[PDB]
Symmetry: C2
Subunit: 273 residues, 2 copies
């Protein structure tokens, strides 16, 4: 009823919080919208960072249409510039309970008027806690055939033990979630004083991890502090609350944008078989 | 146990893993060594980065003395250089359990380490404040003489918005009666190889004011230097366009840890 015209649903996964998985979701969304797709982002990771905060709409009023909730507009579609619309909904609008809280969460998600949508990215909570696993089942239960394109697993090179990406991958295999690929966030550094991107500790090992699972490796994302500034203050990056509709335009000046453009283009060829 | 001649025991604490705690412990050890103190390091943090691997003694064969394990010598004292001996002992020396049994073995392992004469014993604890880890802290409190346990150093990250992490450590230190030597805000900024320019975009004093609001010492701010990692990994001296303790003198982090160490020493002996 709510997702009946959403073409592709992608879950953004993590075995542990603190990997910047909500940053990854934000930039996947912006990049897909820069490629001309209509993008939705559903945030059900109430522990992790606020996705509406990153889109500078954390103070927006969720409008109510006849029979549902209208997602918050980050920016409208723009044919002349070839960018698609971008809309967001947060579980924090609905919100200390047990199974009844799962039932309310499921009703709420089924109440969002997503309308036509090329891609709906889901910011899922980290880890496979019994509370989270049932929510993951809920999505699968309400998903329709062919719709769930699969999952994107976000990790870091820094993790000595990959038991959480091993865990999230194993859960995906166990439940049939297709793994579209793994993203290695915070692998290297881009900085303002000069554009040189460096990771002298190159072997983050996340790629061999992707080999061990015969699973796709979408690429490495460096830290760019000008991205965090852009999200926080709205300042456009330069290389030697903010207005939300300007974000996608300022993002193509961020050094991370060409990286996510390539990650996006490969995610799209994977989902479209 | 066998703390019979350990003058000062410092706990390095953390609300959660991945904050660079084991590396902070590593550099406190090197700095205390460069200041002429004999130093031991007890790694009881299995989930974190292997501290033996940091000191480049991960392939050592630990020996058995008089009813217990003998610590591995990273380097011995050198009065000429003014550096002191540096020993490490970790579980990763002896493993190629979960639940209460895991912590039982870890408590028994701690009991079985023969430390002998020592100015400072640094203890790399597992993060968090679970009841298991509390039991580890309680054991140390019992085997420690009234002046022996100097206090706890709490490592935190400015990027993390979970300040309460800090709080549950200093609440727990005050609940167990463990002095708080200070807070170290790690991963605060980033030094770069292409030029020694440190970049930091967080509050630039947010950890300072938060430690003031808690009435706890603020020991200082430590940025990320990837050349420290390549030195730990390949022995390459950090350049900024023999022994680890001496090569580390060329790492930008070393003057930072000289000042932090010095403040800790003043706090300890008063
Ligand atoms: S400008 Fe270049 S050399 Fe300076 S910190 Fe940034 S990356 Fe490093």
């Amino acid at each position: 009823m709510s997702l009946s015209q959403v073409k592709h649903i992608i879950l953004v996964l993590s075995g542990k919080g603190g990997v910047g998985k909500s940053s990854v979701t934000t930039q996947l969304a912006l990049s897909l919208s820069q490629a001309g797709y209509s993008v939705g982002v559903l945030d059900v990771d109430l522990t992790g960072p606020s996705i509406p905060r990153m889109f500078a709409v954390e103070d927006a009023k969720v409008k109510q249409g006849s029979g549902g909730w209208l997602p918050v507009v980050v920016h409208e579609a723009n044919p002349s510039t070839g960018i698609g619309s971008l809309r967001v909904m947060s579980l924090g609008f609905l919100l200390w309970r047990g199974p009844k809280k799962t039932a309310m969460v499921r009703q709420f998600m089924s109440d969002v008027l997503w309308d036509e949508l090329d891609f709906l990215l889901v910011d899922t909570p980290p880890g496979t806690s019994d509370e989270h696993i049932s929510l993951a089942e809920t999505l699968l239960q309400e998903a329709r055939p062919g719709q769930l394109s699969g999952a994107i697993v976000v990790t870091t090179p820094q993790a000595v033990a990959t038991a959480d990406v091993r865990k999230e991958l194993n859960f995906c295999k166990k439940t049939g979630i297709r793994v579209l690929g793994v993203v290695e966030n915070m692998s290297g550094f881009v900085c303002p004083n000069c554009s040189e991107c460096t990771n002298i500790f190159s072997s983050g090992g996340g790629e061999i991890m992707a080999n061990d699972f015969n699973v796709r490796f979408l690429g490495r994302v460096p830290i760019d502090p000008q991205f965090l500034v852009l999200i926080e203050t709205g300042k456009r990056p330069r290389y030697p609350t903010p207005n939300s509709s300007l974000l996608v335009d300022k993002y193509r000046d961020c050094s991370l944008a060409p990286i996510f453009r390539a990650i996006t283009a490969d995610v799209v060829v994977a989902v479209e078989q």
